[PDB]
């Protein structure tokens, strides 16, 4: 009665995984600064996205099982590794440093944050030796028992971030090969999982800034309206909670020092850049955030939190309960200088369901860093001449509720940045990759004559 | 009257050379053993090979011109070199050693086989000498004229094998690409070359262990119902003769010493493992093979050796001719320690053409090896903790005839490991790679419609 | 009335740019000797090229915008750098050299050309040192404040030239990939730009020797029956002028000294080759060119220069103004040693349009070279023992104009090798690569059957 007919090219897809390839705007070429996330091999992006909107279709998404974030995690590390493959491997610097405190003009709080170190080195000629000095932060030198040594020397040698390549993030687009498509969930209420009433296929994702941060997401994508709380399992106490502000709050971080870069010649053709001296007064690094906006912003976060825990509980915010400096402070880089800001001045409040001082958050700067939770890998950031200042956009917020007493009288939330790939999950949660299945069959009344 | 007609997909093949790719089982993949042969990158194989039998077809075979052997050799070498790249190079070990004989607990025969050596090294800080000592075998040190030096210093620096990776052989399957095929010769009597009445094609070869040995094939395949002898030209004297047993001969090897590994910290993040003190007495290593099951094995071999040499010749066996240690002594590794055994006790007998004593073969251990007859590349196997004992099958044997001055009076056979391909040749002798030729033309009584 | 019909495989092409691959003869690879331009991996060339001559077709050939030169310039650098990767780094050689003048048997001209240097050098063992001596050319040393040092020490270290790889150029063929084509211009008066009535297609270009030189094109391709002048814009002065002799002039370059190579063993697994002493007396290097055949060549060149500058102006030749040795003198590497010949004795003449002295050109040898006018890379060609004699053709000449004082009566031309890619631009001026477009549509009277 019915005969099978084969149709080729029908619009059917299926979830799967592939290897998305890079794509970025050609404006990066004009920079000619050899960005660490090399755009030279990235295919140029299209002049304008072609956002095809699909009518009357629903698809299932899961931002936490998304493979795009996992693939990006590997790519960012791989791009970073390839950059520090041709740069000075600061092996010779493991020598007995003879350091002393600096007390030229020092504030009481900044008593011993940095030291004045002197050590021997080798001129371009092996036979000759030269005595040089440099200023090392107290977080990069440890004592023997005034013998001092670098923290890296008993773990691994640190490469020395080339002084040309730049750490400034630039937008990138992760685009699928032919035979695969990316679906964007335009739904304004899609939290973490479920059928999106509106799904639109796109050529590939928009610009994604690879901004690495802890306890706070900077320069991110804001929600169109309302604040959103994202998590796989709200009840679980050992699960991170992601937030997204509908409006941004600016934070101004500055290093008011006047460090002067000094060049030290070690070996033939290899130079080690170290801080020479300090010009003018010495003041501790800090970040300024307006209390008026933050308290208003924090009030919105509490409003949505009460939805999943009842509209009578007492929501309390507390600082991190422990860990090393990397996980217990807000970490980021601002124009090639890495900050570690004590963020305990923000998460201290209580809500019982009922001027422009610009709150200051003291910060510290580190030169020997890992920033991938890896042992045996390291990098040394040379100093930056003159003062440095930058302004950011605090859009996201990572929190981890902890504790339990069999009583819902109050819930306490603390910042948490254990998972360093959650920065990008907050941007790729709207995307999923599918593979098309053009072949298909369907019975009909057509019969092949011959 | 007939007309040319074309066919596509006909079963026709021609001999060809291609690049077979690896394939290994995933059962042990999750163990994270990190073998020297990167089986993690090998595509998982099918649960069972697709043994397809081809009837009424005879295929020529040549185990000596087969390219599967030559390709395998370069894969093993490439894998071995690829695994030594990340390990630490022991370049700073070339120092004037000051060694003395050890006589704490020594037997008469093992008088000066190892030395107590002391040498000054530099610590993580590159301006402080640290005096350390280690135990070195007599084969890894030479005199200057009281003071010794490592034998490899005047050839090249050596990279020690990382303890994380293991030298345990594991099966690997070589599977050809699409459009090619592999033919298995199922004939039982197929000696070295010629038509194979029973030919079958498989998805790809069975697991082959990359075992490296000399004069004795361990953990190899067994020829059933007979003991086989392979040789491209039996008459030619300078052609290694390969013997494949039908029942394995067990061999037990042990190192009674109980040395304790000692770690020495050199440079940043790099550690060199010394030998450390010896617990208990020191005894020479040895290998045991039962004479009851070995003497009768020779009788089987002699019976087949007479077919190609006459039924009245006198068969004689003598030890190796002599020369370099690696070629004149049975060598292997079990437990990660390389042995070099003296097999003079096995090949010493004569036949006139007509009590588990457990023969013990003394063996010596070497820490500096090349293993590929290569100059400029060396490896340093770190010492293992505790006693090591291994049990293996002798499923094969190699011989090299000598003499021939008399017309036909007697024959003398000696072992020989001159070529390194014989170990894998005995496993790949059943396989041949061919390429398919789907196109074909045959006349028939047919015409085009227009 | 008409219907469009599609034709597949039509003869139509378009200008395009691709990545050509290599093709070399078997003789170079058959020797089994290693070459800097490793043609062993390069695929074998066809037995003969099939130069199909097209008819009635004209193409707009261009040599100044051709990408073949740009691709080949980068390709040559890559192979040259690749061959130096496994060689030995001479970084233990940066020490305070203590040199003195040598006056064993010195010619009047070659007084301070080379110096006798001694220094402290390392040894296989870390705790032992050796004192060695060598003769270094004056161009390779500089006073530290007597105490000298290698010039490259204060820029970058010098990777030694491996002693087996030879710089002997060998012809190579560039073959376009499938789907592309190469067009050859058979016109015998093609001036580099404009329509070429005689066009042909070749699957591979002729063998091009990668000869690197300055001010003179050696071992090139000769024109027939006339001398041709190539230039982007004759009026412009910043643009170089290319000449191509129809007949060659033979130049004999010799190094009369009889240097003796000496091997100094530094560190484990690496050796440094140095120059011991000069058997016999020491004489300056030079090159011989006959006066009779060179005056005629300039007579042909000046005749053609009059077409583009009038038939009454005075044509003058002057030596190079100034600059670095790599640009103000003729350079070449024949016999494995790098020369820098002072060609001021050739370009000194004045023509107003109205015996075998064998001109001798003094040359200075150098051992620390940076061939790819890069900055940072260095190479050290080891000395070659024995007297070396060299014979070469001169089949080209690069010239530059100085300017005009509003009077065309006198015009002076000087040699110049500023850009390294003009050498290969003289061999690829007849070639261009095009893309094959087989799809085409034309109207005919053909209705679809159904």
């Amino acid at each position: 009665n019915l005969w099978v007919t084969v149709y080729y090219g029908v619009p059917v897809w299926k979830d799967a995984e592939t290897t998305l390839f890079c794509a970025s705007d050609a404006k990066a070429y004009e920079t000619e600064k050899h960005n660490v996330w090399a755009t030279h091999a990235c295919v140029p992006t299209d002049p304008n996205p072609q956002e095809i909107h699909l009518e009357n279709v629903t698809e299932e998404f899961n931002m936490w099982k998304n493979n795009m974030v996992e693939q990006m995690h590997t790519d960012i590390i791989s791009l970073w590794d390839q950059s520090l493959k041709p740069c000075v491997k600061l092996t010779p610097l493991c020598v007995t440093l003879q350091c002393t405190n600096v007390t030229n003009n020092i504030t009481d709080d900044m008593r011993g944050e940095l030291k004045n170190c002197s050590f021997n080195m080798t001129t371009e000629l092996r036979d000759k030796k030269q005595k040089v000095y440099s200023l090392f932060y107290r977080l990069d030198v440890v004592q023997i028992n005034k013998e001092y040594r670098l923290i890296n020397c008993n773990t691994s040698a640190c490469t020395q971030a080339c002084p040309k390549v730049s750490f400034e993030p630039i937008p990138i687009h992760y685009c699928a090969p032919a035979g695969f498509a990316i679906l964007k969930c335009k739904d304004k209420k899609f939290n973490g999982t479920g059928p999106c009433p509106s799904v639109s296929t796109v050529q590939c994702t928009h610009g994604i800034k690879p901004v690495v941060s802890t306890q706070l997401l900077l320069n991110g994508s804001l929600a169109e309206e309302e604040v959103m709380i994202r998590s796989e399992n709200i009840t679980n106490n050992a699960k991170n909670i992601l937030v997204q502000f509908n409006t941004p709050v600016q934070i101004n971080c500055t290093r008011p020092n006047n460090n002067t870069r000094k060049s030290i010649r070690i070996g033939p053709g290899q130079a080690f850049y170290a801080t020479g001296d300090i010009i003018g007064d010495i003041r501790q690094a800090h970040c300024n955030v307006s209390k008026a906006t933050w308290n208003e912003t924090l009030g919105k976060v509490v409003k949505q939190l009460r939805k999943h825990f009842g509209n009578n509980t007492i929501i309390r915010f507390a600082n991190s309960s422990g860990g090393d400096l990397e996980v217990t402070t807000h970490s980021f880089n601002c124009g090639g200088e890495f900050f570690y800001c004590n963020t305990s001045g923000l998460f201290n409040s209580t809500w019982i369901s009922n001027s422009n001082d610009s709150i200051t958050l003291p910060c510290r700067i580190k030169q020997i860093i890992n920033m991938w939770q890896r042992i045996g890998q390291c990098m040394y950031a040379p100093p930056i001449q003159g003062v440095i200042r930058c302004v950011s956009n605090i859009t996201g917020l990572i929190l981890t509720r902890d504790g339990g007493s069999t009583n819902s009288t109050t819930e306490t939330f603390r910042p948490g940045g254990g998972d360093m790939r959650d920065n990008w999950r907050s941007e790729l949660y709207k995307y999923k990759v599918v593979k098309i299945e053009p072949l298909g069959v369907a019975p009909t009344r057509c019969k092949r004559r011959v | 009257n007939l007309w040319v007609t074309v066919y596509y997909g006909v079963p026709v093949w021609k001999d060809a050379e291609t690049t077979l790719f690896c394939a290994s089982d995933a059962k042990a993949y999750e163990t994270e053993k990190h073998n020297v042969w990167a089986t993690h990158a090998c595509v998982p194989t099918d649960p069972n090979p697709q043994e397809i039998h081809l009837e009424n077809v005879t295929e020529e075979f040549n185990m000596w011109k087969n390219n599967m052997v030559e390709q395998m050799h370069t894969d093993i070498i490439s894998l071995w070199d690829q695994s030594l790249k990340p390990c630490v190079k022991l370049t700073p070990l070339c120092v004037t050693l000051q060694c003395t004989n050890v006589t704490n607990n020594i037997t008469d025969d093992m008088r000066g086989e190892l030395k107590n050596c002391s040498f000054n090294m530099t610590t993580e800080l590159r301006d402080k000498k640290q005096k350390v000592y280690s135990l070195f075998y007599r084969l890894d040190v030479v005199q200057i004229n009281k003071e010794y030096r490592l034998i490899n210093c005047n050839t090249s620096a050596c990279t020690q094998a990382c303890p994380k990776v293991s030298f345990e052989p594991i099966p690997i399957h070589y599977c050809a690409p699409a459009g090619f095929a592999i033919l298995k010769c199922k004939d039982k009597k197929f000696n070295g070359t010629g038509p194979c009445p029973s030919v079958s094609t498989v998805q790809c070869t069975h697991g082959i262990k990359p075992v490296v040995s000399t004069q004795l094939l361990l953990n190899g395949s067994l020829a059933e119902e007979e003991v086989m002898i392979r040789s491209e030209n039996i008459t030619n004297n300078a052609k290694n003769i390969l013997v494949q047993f039908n029942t394995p001969v067990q061999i037990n090897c042990t190192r009674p010493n109980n040395n304790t590994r000692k770690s020495i910290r050199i440079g940043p993040g790099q550690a060199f493992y010394a030998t450390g003190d010896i617990i208990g007495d020191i005894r020479q290593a040895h290998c045991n093979v039962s004479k009851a099951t070995w003497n009768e094995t020779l009788g089987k071999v002699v019976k087949q050796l007479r077919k190609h040499f006459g039924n009245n010749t006198i068969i004689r066996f003598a030890n190796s001719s002599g020369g370099d240690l690696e070629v004149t002594t049975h060598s292997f590794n079990c437990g990660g320690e390389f042995f070099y055994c003296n097999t003079s006790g096995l090949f010493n007998s004569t036949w006139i053409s007509n009590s588990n004593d457990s023969i013990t073969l003394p063996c010596r251990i070497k820490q500096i090896i090349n293993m590929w007859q290569r100059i400029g590349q060396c490896m340093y196997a770190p010492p293992i903790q505790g006693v090591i004992r291994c049990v293996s099958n002798i499923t094969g044997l190699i011989l090299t005839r000598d003499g021939g001055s008399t017309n036909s009076t007697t024959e003398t056979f000696r072992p020989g490991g001159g070529d390194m391909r014989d170990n894998w040749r005995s496993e790949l002798y059943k396989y041949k790679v061919v390429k398919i030729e789907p196109l074909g033309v045959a006349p028939t009584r047919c015409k085009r419609r227009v | 009335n008409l219907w469009v019909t599609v034709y597949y495989g039509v003869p139509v092409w378009k200008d395009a740019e691709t990545t050509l691959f290599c093709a070399s003869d078997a003789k170079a690879y058959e020797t089994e000797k290693h070459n800097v331009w490793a043609t062993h991996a390069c695929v074998p060339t066809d037995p003969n090229p099939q130069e199909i001559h097209l008819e009635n077709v004209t193409e707009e050939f261009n040599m100044w915008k051709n990408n073949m030169v740009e691709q080949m310039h980068t390709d040559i650098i890559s192979l040259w750098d690749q061959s130096l990767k496994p060689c030995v780094k001479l970084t233990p050689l940066c020490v305070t050299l203590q040199c003195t003048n040598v006056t064993n048997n010195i010619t009047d001209d070659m007084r301070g050309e080379l110096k006798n240097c001694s220094f402290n050098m390392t040894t296989e063992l870390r705790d032992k040192k050796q004192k060695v001596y060598s003769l270094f050319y004056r161009l390779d040393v500089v006073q530290i404040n007597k105490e000298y040092r290698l010039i490259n020490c204060n820029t970058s270290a010098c990777t030694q030239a491996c002693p087996k790889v030879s710089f002997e150029p060998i012809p190579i063929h560039y073959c376009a990939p499938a789907g592309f084509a190469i067009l050859k211009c058979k016109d015998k008066k093609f001036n580099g730009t404009g329509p070429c009535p005689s066009v042909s297609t070749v699957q591979c270009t002729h063998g091009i020797k990668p000869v690197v030189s300055t001010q003179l094109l050696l071992n090139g391709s000769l024109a027939e029956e006339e001398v041709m002048i190539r230039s982007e814009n004759i009026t412009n002065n910043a643009k170089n002028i290319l000449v191509q002799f129809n007949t060659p002039v033979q130049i004999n370059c010799t190094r009369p000294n009889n240097n003796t190579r000496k091997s100094i063993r530094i560190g484990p697994g690496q050796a440094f080759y140095a120059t011991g002493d000069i058997i016999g007396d020491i004489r300056q290097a030079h090159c011989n060119v006959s006066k009779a055949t060179w005056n005629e060549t300039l007579g042909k060149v000046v005749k053609q220069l009059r077409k583009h500058f009038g038939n009454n102006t005075i044509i003058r030749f002057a030596n190079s103004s100034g600059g670095d040795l790599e640009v103000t003198t003729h350079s070449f590497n024949c016999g494995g040693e790098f020369f820098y010949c002072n060609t001021s004795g050739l370009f000194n003449s004045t023509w107003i349009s109205n015996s075998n002295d064998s001109i001798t050109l003094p040359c200075r040898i150098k051992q620390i070279i940076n061939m790819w006018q890069r900055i940072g890379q260095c190479m050290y060609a080891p000395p070659i023992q024995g007297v070396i004699r060299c014979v070469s053709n001169i089949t080209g000449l690069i010239l530059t104009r100085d300017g005009g004082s509003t009077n065309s009566t006198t015009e002076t031309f000087r040699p110049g090798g500023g850009d390294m890619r003009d050498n290969w631009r003289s061999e690829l001026y007849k070639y261009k690569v095009v893309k094959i477009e087989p799809l085409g549509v034309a109207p005919t009277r053909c209705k679809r059957r159904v």
Partner: antibody
Framework: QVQLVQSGAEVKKPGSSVKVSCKAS????????VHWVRQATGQGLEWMGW????????GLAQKFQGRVTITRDSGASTVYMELRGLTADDTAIYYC?????????????????????????????????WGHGTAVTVSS | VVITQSPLFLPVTPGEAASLSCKCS???????????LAWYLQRPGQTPRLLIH???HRASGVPDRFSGSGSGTDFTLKISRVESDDVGTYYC?????????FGQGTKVEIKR
């Protein structure tokens, strides 16, 4: 013949601190080493201390450990010495003199890419011209 | 470290050669290897004057009569035509190993 001057003779009771001064014309301390020696009637000479012309390294005998100090003024204009534990048997005559040293290398391990680990040492070569000296006696 | 010299006394007639030797417990070739020897003449009531250093070279202005030789752990000083002007005590000094100390010394008197 370089003229040299020394402080005049002084007498102090046992178990007390004293100060002495010595100066050299031409600032010869820059390129010469200074040692202190004493002599007693019927007995041989005895060395007390020394200083390197670099001024980096100094040393004394094991018996003088923790009881003798050497100080120099800025610019090497003058130097002063401190004496402790005087005894009636310590009668002798002080002297001012220069010296020379032979600084050689005893050991070296060749670090790959970093500063070498060298063990330097000093060996006294000769005693240069002496001065007229100063006589010091202990009595009570 | 200890140092000894001998003989304590040895009368020498004027115009006759004399030999004196000084040694220390540590061998001159103990660790580094070199002489580092110094010879001084102690004129009574006057400062000592260096004669020869290391027994290998003679200081400028010193008479050529003084000479030295020997090897190993023992060395001797050879002087031709001894004169009463050399009467005094001779002290040997070592610079091989710190601390640096003088020898005990010996006295030579003209026979009378």
């Amino acid at each position: 013949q370089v003229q040299l001057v020394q402080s005049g003779a002084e007498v102090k009771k046992p178990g007390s601190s004293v100060k002495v001064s010595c100066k050299a014309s031409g600032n010869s301390f820059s390129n010469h080493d200074v040692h202190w020696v004493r002599q007693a009637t019927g007995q041989g000479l005895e060395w007390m201390g020394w200083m390197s012309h670099e001024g980096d390294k100094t040393g004394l005998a094991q018996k003088f450990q923790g009881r003798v100090t050497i100080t120099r003024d800025s610019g090497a204009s003058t130097v002063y010495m401190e004496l402790r534990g005087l005894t009636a048997d310590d009668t002798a005559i002080y002297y001012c003199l220069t010296g020379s040293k032979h600084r050689l290398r005893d050991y070296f391990l060749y670090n790959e890419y970093g500063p070498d680990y060298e063990e330097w040492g000093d060996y006294l070569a000769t005693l240069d011209v002496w001065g007229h000296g100063t006589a010091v006696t202990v009595s009570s | 470290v200890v140092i000894t010299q001998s003989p304590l006394f040895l009368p020498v007639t004027p115009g006759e050669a004399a030999s004196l030797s000084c040694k220390c417990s540590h061998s001159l070739q103990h660790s580094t290897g070199a002489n580092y020897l110094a010879w001084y003449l102690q004129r009574p009531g006057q400062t000592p004057r260096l004669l020869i250093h290391l027994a290998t070279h003679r200081a400028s202005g010193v008479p050529d009569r003084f000479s030295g030789s020997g090897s190993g752990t023992d060395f001797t000083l050879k002087i031709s035509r001894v004169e009463s002007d050399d009467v005094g005590t001779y002290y040997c000094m070592q610079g091989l190993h710190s601390p640096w100390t003088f020898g005990q010394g010996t006295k030579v008197e003209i026979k009378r």
